[PDB]
Amino acid sequence: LHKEPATLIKAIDGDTVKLMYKGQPMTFRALLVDTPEFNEKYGPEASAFTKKMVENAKKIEVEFDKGQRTDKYGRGLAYAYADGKMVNEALVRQGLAKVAYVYKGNNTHEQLLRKAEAQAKKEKLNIWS
Ligand SMILES: Cc1cn([C@H]2C[C@H](OP(=O)(O)O)[C@@H](COP(=O)(O)O)O2)c(=O)[nH]c1=O
Ligand SMILES: [Ca+2]
């Protein structure tokens, strides 16, 4: 896989963000994770965590996996990075997202993310508290 440039347009919630990619606005959905909706427990915390990460980044990148690049709602499906740090992993590591939506052929980072989830669960963080 390879990282590609994007720029922040607007934070949306814990696992979606609006980015400009190849010059076009798109809503991205983070691969392999599920944050609570804003109306659910830890939803506002997941939103704030992703907002801070993408707003403070000097450099955002997206990395597509090997499979589907957009979902049925037209959202981009990618791993998002903020100054080299994976958003998807960081949410899981902090107990603000569960590993989820693991479809065959877009699952390159699945075991990296599951290792982060096991760590957050051991630490009883957030969703795992
Ligand atoms: C993360 C992800 C979601 N989706 C679809 C599955 C779910 O469909 P349904 O809307 O029919 O439940 C939805 C979950 O996204 P959200 O968690 O953003 O609601 O997005 C994919 O198709 N591919 C993916 O990789
Ligand atoms: Ca969600």
From Swiss-Prot:
Region (Disordered): 109-129
Record's compositionally biased regions (Basic and acidic residues): 109-125
Binding-site residues for Ca(2+), renumbered to this chain: D15, D34, T35
Catalytic-site annotation from UniProt: R29, E37, R75
Compartment(s) of residence: Secreted
Protein name: Nuclease A
Origin species: Staphylococcus aureus
Taxon lineage: Bacteria, Bacillati, Bacillota, Bacilli, Bacillales
Full-protein interval shown: 89 to 223 of 231
